[PDB]
Ligand SMILES: CC(=O)Nc1nnc(S(N)(=O)=O)s1
């Protein structure tokens with residue numbers, strides 16, 4: 001079933017597009033969120049074990065995704081190890097800090113060995129060109145499709161050395177809006193060109209951020 005960010009199948013209507021998408025409207029622990037008030041807590045430190053891999057670059061209609069057909073890129077937090085599957089982008093950002101929307105956001109999507117999902121998010125301010133992303137931007141499929149990149153890509157370069165994060169629980173930001181997703185949002189921001197942002201939008205065909213959702217019961221730790 002088709003869905004999107006504009007027109008008549010937009011995010012406020014995702015719930016009634018089918019029965020399997022119904023948590024997009026009835027869920028109480030949904031992403032993204034406006035992080036406004038937090039609780040200052042002793043969060044467990046992130047350990048990134050990312051290395052170069054032979055990735056491919058896909059345009060799936062809704063985003064530009066970079067898929068990892070093997071394990072090997074992991075991140076460890078609080079004892080559990082999480083395998084990176086794919087990372088991808090929203091322009092503009094989905095999550096907000098104090099009502100601030102950033103020109104782009106990245107989502108590094110993982111499963112531990114229980115299939116318990118974790119999203120690690122990087123936020124992009126407007127700034128100089130992103131040298132480390134230009135490898136992906138060059139081959140970026142400008143319609144639905146897939147290119148195997150034939151030079152190794154290193155996702156370690158897309159994460160900061162300073163790894164403080166905001167921690168909450170949430171959902172996918174795309175249908176079926178499944179819950180049980182751990183959200184870690186990094187505090188140190190990366191940077192993108194105005195042109196890299198336009199180009200993404202040109203490829204994907206729209207602004208691909210879901211509107212922010214109520215926190216309800218949820219507390220955000222920082
Ligand atoms: C099948 C699948 O993996 N779907 C998703 N992955 N990441 C998502 S996002 N916008 O929540 O981070 S939705």
Ligand SMILES: [Zn+2]
Nearest residue numbers: 088090107173
């Ligand atoms: Zn996403």
